[PDB]
Structure formats: C-alpha cells, structure tokens
Design a protein around this ligand. Structure first.
Ligand SMILES: Cc1cc(C(=O)Nc2ccncc2)on1
Ligand SMILES: [Cl-]
Ligand SMILES: [Mn+2]
Ligand SMILES: [Zn+2]
Length: 452
C-alpha cells in the first residue's frame, strides 16, 4: 500500500584490522555487496574524523530542484552560507511537517517523498549544494595547508579520507595524468529534506564511495550491477524521453523503487547516518533523497577488479554513441609504461587487459587494411584535447588508432567506423596509430615480468 520499502542493503562493521585497508576490505565484502549494488559501512567507533568548520565563512551557490517523478533533470554542472542554508532547510522541514525536525520518522519522510514526487498537484521545489572542493568550500576531511590538531593529522592520510582515494596505488584512476576533473576529485553535497539525486550509474562503471559527515540521514536505493539493463529497459518504456541522444546533458530521473520491483528489478535500500559510508559497486544504479540538513562528500574510484568492466563499459559507450570521460586504453598504456613501479597484483591485471586490447587492435588493423587503408603515421593522441579526438560516429575517445582523411581535415573515426568519415576512396585515408604491435608486446612483457 502507498509505498513498500525495499529490503535493506548489507551493513558492514569492520574491526580496526579489516578496516585499516579500504581496498582490502571492499574486496572482502564484494561478493556480498555486488548482489545488492549498494552497501553500508560503519567505521569502528574509534574512527572519528574531526569535522571542523565555521558555518559562516563557507559559502556556495544553490542549485534548484523540482520534485516530479519521471521528469527529466540534468546531472549537476543566489548564494548561501552553510549557516543560512542550514536555517532555510530546518525552517522548511519543520514547517512542512509542523514538527521539530528530529521528530519526523524517517519512514514518514520516505512515504512522503514518494507521495509528493508522484502527485503533480504539488509542486515542491528544494535547493541544494553540489560542487567539487574549492577555495570557498573545501573538503570536510583534513587536507594540507593552517596548522592542524594532533588528531586531525591522524586522519590526514587515512585510506578512508576521500581526498586520498584517487591517488592511492591500489586504485587505478590514480596514475591517470589526464585531468578527469569531475571524476578523480571528491564532490561536496549539502542536503535538505527531499533534495534528491536521480537514478544513475557512475561514469565508466566505476565504484563510488560516499561519506556522510554530519546532519540528518540520507536515504539510498540501489540495484545490483547485474540488473542494470533490466532497469534500463523498464525506464525506456515508462520514460522514453530520457533516452534521446545528447551532446554532459544526459537526462536522469526520479522513479519509484516499487515500480522497478513490480517489473522484477531487485532494489535495496538503506538510511545512511552521520559517520557512515555508502559504497556503490560497478554498473549499480542508485538514487535517493535527504531526510534533512546534512553534508556529504563522495568520490569515484577503480580497483583492479574493475579493469575488465572498464573495457566492457567503453565498448558499451561506443554502441550508445555515449562520450567517454577518459580513454581506457590510454590508461592501460600509461600503467604499462610505469610497469616497474607498479603494484604487482595490479600489474598482473593490467597485463590480462593489455592482452585483450592488443589482439582486438591487431584484428581491427587487419580489417582496415583490407578496406584499402594503406598509408599510416604514428600519432600522439594523448596530446590532443579529448574533444579533438572523438570518433565522429560513435564519439569514443581515440588513443590506440584512428582513421583520418585529407578530404575531411581534423575529423577522425575509430577503426570500427572507417566507412563513416567521408566519401573519398581508401587510399586517401590514413591510419593514425599510437603504437606499432612491435611497440606493444614489449610493454605487455614488462607487465608479465613485474607480475612474474
Ligand atoms: C541533492 C543532493 C544529492 C546528494 C548526493 O549525495 N548525491 C549523489 C549524486 C550522485 N551519486 C550519489 C549521490 O546530496 N544532496
Ligand atoms: Cl510533484
Ligand atoms: Mn552516484
Ligand atoms: Zn567510432
């Protein structure tokens, strides 16, 4: 009736030992958590990062949000101090329910959220903050500059400090030189009651990890990675407008979990409270809303486990003609080029992915040869701005190889879309390649050595 809450997602309480290494721990829980898409992690009670801030000096620009189910919204791109926002947000929740904010049951806000997003009689609109850390509004975790407490430095380089999550050596996005700005850096989220984030998966099917610093809880819904296409099909029918192609302007939407459960999509939920961690697994759809005033920090990340998924995702993007954030192949080769200083298990996994990359590339080069492309020249793709090296057809970011033509100066196609560049005859085409097969096999061999 009304709303049936989805079954709760797995909750984990690592001891200090298992908690010590984030990447170790995530790998342990992975067979469990990947069945539910999201999971929750409560740090040992000991572990308590000092969030220190002046609520008056931290300003940010509010984004505005209408609350209608199945209505398209864009993924994020006056002015509030954290205090004035806190005051607006508590006033709002308190007025909406005629109650003190911490006396509204979470059950109720959930019920009420889904009621007001379906009723287009109501048009409730809320505000929120979303931004990567900057000079006016910084990470809620300890960084490096002012002088820190003796305890603030304890957490200064914890693995669960989310600033450290990109740059760790068991992470893969780590050694990406390319400034994948929005991806490798933490986002900051200032919530109020009903402010929400629509159904989505992460760029390149990466993990994410989300930390609630303080404030009222955040409610999550999650779908395991294996049911992603099932969910997408359900959303194609009930809301086909979200799927019309787009030059960052992906459309995402709010949709009732019960609607998905009804169509046999497994959904899980949790309330994330202050000091708890939520982890989303690869290709795991999620959405949720805030119970009231709160502050969260989140970051994208990639493990060795993810590398094959990372390849599969880029293949998938190509079919969808969806833009890439970074070149998977460029990442692999950068790792191969630093094979000597690589973590050994990392090296073994890069090696297996390199092996696939190379044999696919061999085949693709044979194919474009038999299409009459004869001329060729090495090309340093990594020097090109990403928008200067997308396949004109499927929009994938080129790095291993591309086809150019003197007839269409500056355009490129991947080797899958040779026939889609221009109407000149094959001998006017040119294979632009980063590496010869002879350059590549030694790069892989260095990985095999480092892994033994
Ligand atoms: C509004 C609002 C959103 C959040 C938040 O946490 N959003 C999020 C976005 C993408 N993936 C996961 C979560 O907080 N306030
Ligand atoms: Cl509405
Ligand atoms: Mn997300
Ligand atoms: Zn292409």
């Amino acid at each position: 009736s009304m709303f049936l809450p989805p079954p709760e997602c797995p909750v984990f309480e690592p001891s200090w030992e298992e908690f010590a290494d984030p990447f170790a721990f995530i790998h342990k829980i992975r067979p469990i958590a990947e069945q539910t898409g999201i999971c929750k992690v409560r740090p040992p009670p000991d572990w308590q990062p000092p969030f220190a801030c002046d609520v008056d000096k931290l300003h940010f620009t509010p984004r505005i949000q209408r609350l209608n189910e199945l209505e398209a919204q864009t993924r994020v791109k006056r002015d509030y101090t954290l205090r004035t926002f806190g005051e607006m947000a508590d006033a709002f929740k308190s007025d909406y329910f005629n109650m003190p904010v911490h006396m509204v049951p979470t059950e109720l806000v959930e019920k009420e959220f889904w009621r007001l997003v379906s009723t287009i009689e109501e048009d409730v609109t809320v505000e929120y903050g979303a931004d990567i850390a900057s000079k006016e509004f910084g990470s809620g975790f300890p960084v490096r500059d002012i002088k820190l407490s003796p305890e603030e430095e304890e957490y200064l380089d914890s693995g669960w400090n989310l600033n450290n999550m990109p740059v760790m050596e068991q992470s893969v996005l780590a050694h990406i030189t390319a400034d994948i700005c929005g991806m490798k850096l933490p986002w900051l989220y200032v919530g109020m009651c009903f402010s929400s984030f629509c159904w989505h998966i992460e760029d390149h099917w990466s993990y994410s990890i989300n930390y609630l610093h303080w404030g009222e809880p955040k409610t999550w819904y999650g779908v395991p990675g294996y049911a992603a296409e099932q969910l997408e099909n359900v959303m194609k029918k009930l809301a086909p407008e979200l799927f019309v192609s787009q030059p960052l302007h992906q459309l995402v939407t709010i949709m009732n979990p019960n609607t998905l459960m009804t169509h046999e999509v497994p959904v899980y939920r949790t309330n994330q409270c202050a000091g708890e961690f939520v982890i989303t697994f690869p290709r795991a759809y999620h959405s949720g809303f805030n119970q009231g005033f709160n502050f969260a920090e989140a970051v994208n990340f990639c493990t060795v486990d993810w590398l094959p998924l990372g390849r599969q995702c880029v293949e998938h993007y190509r079919l969808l003609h969806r833009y890439c954030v970074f070149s998977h192949d460029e990442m692999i080769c950068k790792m191969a080029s630093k094979a000597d200083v690589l973590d050994v298990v990392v090296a073994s996994t890069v090696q297996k992915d390199m092996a696939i990359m190379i044999e696919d590339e061999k085949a693709l080069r044979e194919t474009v040869r038999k299409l009459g492309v004869i001329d060729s020249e090495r090309m340093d793709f990594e020097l090109l701005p990403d928008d200067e090296r997308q396949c004109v057809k499927c929009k994938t970011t080129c790095f291993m190889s591309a086809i150019s033509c003197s007839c269409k100066p500056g355009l490129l196609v991947c080797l899958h879309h040779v026939k889609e560049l221009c109407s000149c005859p094959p001998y006017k085409y040119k294979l632009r390649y980063r590496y010869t097969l002879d350059d590549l096999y030694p790069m892989m061999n260095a990985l095999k050595l480092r892994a033994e």
